[PDB]
């Protein structure tokens, strides 16, 4: 605290250790609400220096459901109106209905999450990634563990449904070397009978494709 | 409601015996007394008729999927979470669209995947294109060199 109009930033306290009472509690790390304590016992400046927060979880962390990212039900000590009674109360976070679209499982999915999760989802690139880079005891949800499983399947199904495109392109490539000439349409049966990729399915499928050449023009 | 015998026999010989040439037992003929149930009774005994799809593969294409480098992991269906309990208490919960809700998902086995925006799909199609590029070395032989350059960096030291 200094009184000049324009106090340009500087390395150290320009005018000695900052004077005032509230500067006395900031010089020791406490927050400026220590100025309103009537007793500042060695436990008090421990209690209010936030060494370890007096703040807990509504249900057991092992049995928690709604995704509370990094929150507790912190109690806020209020001082009442005209006659200053001091009372305290437990303030919760705001849980929104998280109705997201996790494109891993190509469908909306709902998990109720605190506002802070609805931000850290978007900071993580998607809803699913926020489920996936968090880990067990960190993402202490239960719904988050039911939707991580579907996320872990419906990912390892994409990877599986990918290698299809590498076992299919292998066939498609290696069979083209036997669809080389249109000499015999009795032979196009035999090459198809070779890879057991029947004609009646393929013929019209290519037909629908040349029609699709006409469906897309 | 096809209740009175005169009405049930007037429908059952015509639609389930006549049109479909199905024949219902006695104990099912009891509950087979509505347009809703007539439809289902058929739609079970005709669904139990389609020859079970025969997974038959040729040989010439078979040796392709064997020698092909990239193979499927293919065990994930079990990782899926189980919801086993009394069929009612499990089903009473889905009194409404409690289906996609609260970390559940009606997992229908999907055979093809949308490729647009699908992170986990582009997350590997590049990792694949990073595998075809690394694979290019071993084809030409710059891998063996760049690997034989380590041991000659790690020998004289």
């Amino acid at each position: 605290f200094s009184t000049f109009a324009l106090n340009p930033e500087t390395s150290r306290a320009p005018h000695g250790p900052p004077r005032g009472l509230i500067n006395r509690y900031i010089s020791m790390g406490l927050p400026p609400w220590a100025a309103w304590c009537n007793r500042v016992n060695r436990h008090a400046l421990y209690r209010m220096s936030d060494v370890s927060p007096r703040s807990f979880l509504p249900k057991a962390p092992h049995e928690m459901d709604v995704i509370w990212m990094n929150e507790r039900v912190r109690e806020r000590v209020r001082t009442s109106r005209q006659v200053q009674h001091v009372y305290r109360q437990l303030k919760y976070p705001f849980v929104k209905t998280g109705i997201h679209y996790s494109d891993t499982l190509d469908h909306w999915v709902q998990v109720p999450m605190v506002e802070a999760a609805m931000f850290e989802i978007e900071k993580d690139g998607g809803f699913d990634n926020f489920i996936l880079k968090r880990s067990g005891p960190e993402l202490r949800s239960t719904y988050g563990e039911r939707i991580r499983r579907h996320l872990l399947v419906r990912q390892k199904e994409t990877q599986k449904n990918f290698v299809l495109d590498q076992q299919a392109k292998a066939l498609a490539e290696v069979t083209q070397a036997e669809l080389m000439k249109a000499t015999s349409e009795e032979e196009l049966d035999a090459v198809l009978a070779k890879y057991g990729m029947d004609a009646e399915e393929f013929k019209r499928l290519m037909a629908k494709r040349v029609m699709e050449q006409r469906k897309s023009v | 409601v096809f209740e009175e015998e005169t009405l049930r026999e007037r429908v059952l010989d015509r639609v389930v015996e006549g049109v479909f040439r199905l024949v219902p037992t006695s104990t099912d003929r009891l509950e087979l007394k509505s347009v809703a149930n007539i439809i289902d009774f058929v739609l079970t005994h005709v669904t139990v008729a389609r020859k079970p799809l025969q997974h038959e593969i040729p040989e010439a294409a078979r040796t392709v999927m064997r020698s092909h480098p990239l193979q499927p992991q293919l065990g994930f269906v079990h990782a899926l979470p189980t919801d086993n309990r009394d069929a009612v208490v499990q089903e009473w919960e889905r009194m409404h669209h409690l289906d996609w809700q609260f970390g559940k998902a009606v997992y229908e086995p999907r055979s093809a995947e949308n490729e647009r925006g699908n992170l986990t799909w582009l997350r590997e199609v590049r990792h694949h294109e990073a595998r075809e590029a690394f694979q290019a070395d071993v084809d030409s032989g710059e891998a063996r060199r760049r690997h034989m350059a380590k041991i000659k960096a790690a020998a004289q030291v």
């Binding site: 392109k169 066939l171 498609a172 069979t175 290519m206 | 294409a61």
Partner: peptide, 7 residues
């Protein structure tokens, strides 16, 4: 059936 659809 996927190798079918490419062609």
């Amino acid at each position: 059936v996927r190798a079918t659809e490419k062609l």
